[PDB]
Ligand SMILES: Nc1ncnc2c1ncn2[C@@H]1O[C@H](COP(=O)(O)OP(=O)(O)O)[C@@H](O)[C@H]1O
């Protein structure tokens with residue numbers, strides 16, 4: 001009874017609890033509550049949504065089908081978070 | 089064994105020295121593809137593009153966690169909570 | 184192919200300042216991106232500055248003014264002094 | 277006659293012909309002066325020298341003879357003026373500046 | 384260096400030196416410009432045991448190649464005893480030549496221990512010091528044994544040699560051997576890249592399928608054994624006149640017949656009555672279903688609908704894989720599943736026709752997700768089945784194969800995947816397999832049908848291959864066919 005794909009895991013939960021804790025430590029915190037994980041997942045999802053939306057807009061304007069690193073840099077700079085290192 | 093907080097300060101020292109990536113590579117890359125599925129079907133992604141996305145995401149989350157920690161310390165605490173992170177985002181003109 | 188870089192000029196300035204060190208490729212790319220970003224900032228500010236004054240010429244005056252507007256504090260002063268030094272030496276020679 | 281470059285006769289190292297070319301074919305203004313490329317090259321050279329010297333200082337402070345993005349990050353964030361100028365940039369693979377809040381330390 | 388380098392040249396010219404292209408074109412030109420002016424027939428038992436007659440001359444061929452000091456690849460077919468014919472040669476060095484060790488036993492992870500089992504059964508009192516295990520037990524084993532310089536036979540897997548390179552890089556070697564060498568077919572593959580730096584006198588490669596994808600892969604094997612001799616593919620690929628098809632009158636191929644004569648030794652399973660039974664095939668053509676006919680047209684004309692060519696192979700296999708083609712919720716497993724699969728409609732009837740005959744079918748399918756559809760279809764028909772596909776541990780695999788290879792066993796259909804691990808798995812207690820989906824590499828399906836056709840098979844084994852009609856599968860099969868037929872014109876006329 002498993003011809004369908006009943007087995008699957010959500011993608012946002014791939015951002016593991018210890019990964020959240022590693023980010024938190026590099027930030028410099030000492031104790032983390034239990035709901036920081038869910039809230040962080042939500043915040044990261046929203047940020048990625050915005051940036052990827054702008055990048056995809058650039059790529060589809062250029063009449064392409066690949067999102068280039070330079071297009072991502074353009075989208076990120078437009079959001080106002082200029083990134084040094086990936087060209088441009 | 090160790091008194092509480094010792095390993096925490098040790099890990100802060102560990103992770104403020106390093107410059108590596110903190111989120112796993114493939115889980116983040118899969119998340120990026122899945123979240124980019126809806127805007128337009130059949131998009132390709134090159135490794136440099138995904139790496140730039142991960143760099144931006146990590147920097148954003150690290151700065152956010154610094155702001156959250158400062159909020160928590162302001163309220164006479166040491167644990168961070170969703171109240172703290174919500175205040176930090178909404179005071180930065182994001183929420 | 185044939186992509187312009189600034190890398191050789193950055194390396195020349197490095198070998199002038201610290202004549203025993205080097206630059207990794209990632210650092211060189213970062214430095215090139217920094218130079219391009221600051222160049223486009225200065226040029227855009229100068230363009231807007233000339234457009235505000237019904238002027239149709241970029242010149243050293245508003246290049247200097249854009250430098251003064253963007254660079255903060257001591258950076259602006261030192262950069263302006265060096266720019267004037269270079270331009271006067273160029274015109275004299 | 278023999279040709280000598282504007283970079284050389286200006287005393288600089290950064291290119292002046294390339295800067296003039298970009299200013300012209302960059303849609304910044306209709307017509308471009310003849311001292312602006314020199315001034316811009318001088319300013320770019322000054323900023324490059326400043327940040328490179330700080331980065332080299334940090335690199336030797338860590339007993340290394342090659343500047344890396346970590347040293348760039350460290351120099352930029354430790355100098356306050358460059359920190360304000362580059363406040364909104366994120367140097368990739370730069371890490372973070374070490375900092376632990378005083379309250380968090382044990383008694 | 385040059386003493387062997389020169390001596391090999393005229394020796395090539397000695398035994399049917401009909402090459403006349405790269406022996407002189409090759410900076411060895413000035414080296415040969417100087418010379419431009421011009422046995423164990425008794426099944427010997429130094430290694431314990433008797434050697435069956437056709438196995439000896441291979442060893443002497445290795446001995447002759449050693450006595451001439453040139454590397455060679457043997458091409459014994461699967462199940463023919465390459466293991467014995469390998470260690471016998473090392474015994475020759477230890478006994479006749481008195482040169483015991485060091486040597487490598489680079490082999491797949493599955494067969495790491497297996498050779499040592501066979502090593503002792505014909506040649507005890509041997510220095511076999513397998514390097515395998517976790518990060519630790521391997522580590523201290525390096526100093527005492529690998530750095531102890533007290534071995535003759537070293538066993539290590541593909542993954543190991545790319546990990547413990549630094550120890551083995553230092554150690555000088557006489558010979559290095561690699562079993563199932565075809566993993567060295569991409570000359571830029573990192574394992575092939577590493578082996579370039581291993582110091583050795585000559586190398587031995589064991590294979591049964593040298594030519595699988597192109598003829599370019601052969602030179603990569605040749606670039607390994609004798610890098611000086613070949614050292615290039617332009618003189619090998621293009622010079623061979625576009626695989627010698629559009630510009631040949633059966634003459635340049637005749638040249639290559641004897642060109643790579645003293646390097647390979649491929650002996651047929653026909654000359655030995657081991658299986659003693661030829662195989663059978665069908666290429667039954669399936670009228671494409673109705674709902675599939677909708678999808679195939681839909682895919683063409685413009686959900687992750689990328690990599691179109693394989694997408695059409697999904698439609699040619701089963702539309703239920705497209706997430707939505709099957710009827711919506713609730714989900715039932717009934718005959719409606721059978722209708723929407725052109726192959727399964729044909730396959731269903733044939734699955735019935737062998738049930739009464741006591742046959743047990745061995746389905747080999749691509750796209751392991753395809754197995755799930757067959758698995759539930761198997762569940763619907765109340766059939767005895769077990770599954771061994773990828774992501775199933777070997778202990779699960781061995782108990783699963785026991786259920787099929789049991790005395791008075793009862794499993795009818797036993798699912799696998801076209802790869803299904805190494806050759807080792809024994810499926811000789813069976814009579815029918817089904818290649819539900821074809822593959823780009825015919826050799827990739829050659830050995831899969833050899834899973835049933837392996838040694839000990841008495842009754843006739845029947846092999847199927849479903850082919851979609853007027854679709855992508857039509858061109859894939861001929862692509863496999865010409866690549867398959869390329870093997871015969873190149874190899875299958877030497878021995
Ligand atoms: N002369 C012989 N006498 C008895 N058994 C033999 C002889 N030669 C080979 N064998 C057996 O036949 C088997 C064939 O295995 P082989 O095909 O060499 O394994 P692999 O394919 O992993 O190299 C060996 O396990 C060996 O025990």
Ligand SMILES: [Mg+2]
Nearest residue numbers: 465494562563
């Ligand atoms: Mg074998």
